[PDB]
Amino acid sequence: EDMAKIYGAVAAVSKNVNSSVTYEVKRGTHELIKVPTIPHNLVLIQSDNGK
Amino acid sequence: FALAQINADDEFIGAIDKESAEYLDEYATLARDISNSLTLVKAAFGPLER
DSSP states (O other), rough: HHHHHHHHHHHHHTTOOOOOOOOOOOOTOOOOOOOOOOOOOOOOOOOOOOO | OOOOOOOOHHHHHHHHHHHHHHHHHHHHHHHHHHHHHHHHHHOOOOOOOO
């Protein structure tokens, strides 16, 4: 029974090692909006008689 | 000044005899506990660095 207890203690320590890590890298990634209409900012002015 | 002589009653002799058996059981149990712990340290732990 004592040997069973000791081996369980040692086995638990041996399992405490760590395999790896995982993470997502996203810094600097910004979303893009979409612009439907091109701004022209033009106005046509005409005389009343069209001169 | 008031030293009193010692009377060894039969009950006192029996009392020590029961204690003698208990001490043996305690000494045997402690030695086994020490031996188990010494074996655990060798496999569970190693040397410590700074």
